[PDB]
From a paper:
The Arctic mutation, encoding E693G in the amyloid precursor protein (APP) gene [E22G in amyloid-β (Aβ)], causes dominantly inherited Alzheimer’s disease. In summary, we report the structures of Aβ filaments from a case of AD with the Arctic mutation and from mouse knock-in line AppNL−G−F. These findings have implications for our understanding of AD pathophysiology. Comparison of local conformations in this region revealed the presence of additional hydrogen bonds between adjacent Aβ molecules in mutant protofilaments; these hydrogen bonds cannot form in wild-type protofilaments, providing a plausible explanation for the increased fibrillogenesis of E22G Aβ. Mutation E22G may have an additional fibrillation-promoting effect, which is the relief of electrostatic repulsion as a result of removal of the negatively charged carboxylic group of E22; in the wild-type structure, E22 is trapped in close proximity to the carboxylic group of D23.
Most filaments, solved to 2.0 Å resolution, are made of four mutant protofilaments, with two copies each of non-identical protofilaments A and B. The ordered cores of protofilaments A and B, hereafter referred to as the human Arctic folds A and B, consist of residues V12–V40 and E11–G37, respectively. Each fold comprises four β-strands (β1–β4) that extend from residues 12 to 15, 18 to 21, 30 to 32 and 34 to 36 in fold A, and from residues 11 to 13, 14 to 19, 30 to 32 and 34 to 36 in fold B. Human Arctic fold A is almost identical to the fold of type II protofilaments of wild-type Aβ42, but it is shorter by two C-terminal amino acids. The substructures that are common to folds A and B form a dimeric and pseudo-symmetric interface that is centered on residues G25 and S26 from both folds and is stabilized by salt bridges between D23 from one fold and K28 from the other fold, and vice versa. These doublets of protofilaments A and B pack together with C2 symmetry to form the tetrameric filaments. The interface between doublets is also stabilized by two salt bridges, between the main chain carboxyl group of the C-terminal residue V40 from protofilament A in one doublet and the side chain of K16 from protofilament B in the other doublet, and vice versa. Our high-resolution cryo-EM maps of Aβ filaments with the Arctic mutation showed the absence of side chain densities at G22, unlike the corresponding maps for wild-type Aβ filaments. In the majority of filaments, half of the protofilaments (human Arctic fold A) are made of Aβ40, with the terminal carboxyl group of V40 contributing to the protofilament interface, whereas the other half (human Arctic fold B) may contain a variable number of residues after G37. In these dimeric filaments, the terminal carboxyl group of A42 contributes to the protofilament interface. These findings establish that the parenchymal deposits of E22G Aβ differ from those of wild-type Aβ by the presence of abundant Aβ40 filaments.
Author numbering:
A (entry chain A), B (entry chain A), C (entry chain A), G (entry chain C), H (entry chain C), I (entry chain C): 12 to 40
D (entry chain B), E (entry chain B), F (entry chain B), J (entry chain D), K (entry chain D), L (entry chain D): 11 to 37
The structure:
């Protein structure tokens, strides 16, 4: 089982007001 | 089982107010 | 089993207020 | 048993409240 | 048993409250 | 038993409160 | 010759995002 | 010749984001 | 010839983010 | 002669500008 | 002659500017 | 002749500027 670079941003990210999650298994975001 | 670069952004991302998730298995976003 | 670059953005992304998910198996978004 | 909820209420303006507004009421 | 909740209430303006606004009420 | 909550209330302005605003009320 | 209480609010006004004008003779609102 | 109480609020006003004008003769609001 | 109490607030005013003008003859608001 | 204007542009979000956005251009 | 203007631009968010944004440009 | 202006630009957030943003440009 190999998980790598599941979300990849090659450029810039200006503003995050939401959620950025690699792997989401449980909980509330 | 090989998961790589499931969401890939080659350019810029201005603003995120929502969700960006690689792999979504459970929970509430 | 090989999952790669399931959602690919070659240009820019201005604003996300919704969901961008690579692979969606369970949960509520 | 009540668990794992997200609630997003009132994205715009609310003029007047003369009653009750309650997020979570238990019992 | 009540657990794991997120509540986001009133993203804009509220003019007037003359009643009750309660986040979490237990018992 | 009530546990693990996040509450975000009133992101904008509130003009006037003449009633009650309570975060968490126990008993 | 006598203008009085042309707009009368006996109760409460929650929010105004528009125009409330007594007497409108010229201009742009 | 007599202008009085052209806009009358007997109760409370919660929030104003617009215009409240007694008498509007010229200009831009 | 007599202008009096053109806008009258008998109760409270919570917040103003707009304009409250008695008499508007020229200009930009 | 150009006078007495009010301009309210872009009440929501703008994702991306790659061109020109100009309030007032004279000459 | 250009006079008496009010300009209210961009009430929400702007993600990315890669071009030009100019309030007032004279000549 | 350019006179008597009010400019209110960018009430929310700006993520990224890679270009130009100029209030007033004369000549």
């Amino acid at each position: 089982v190999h998980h790598q670079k599941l979300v990849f941003f090659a450029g810039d990210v200006g503003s995050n007001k939401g959620a950025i999650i690699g792997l989401m298994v449980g909980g509330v975001v």
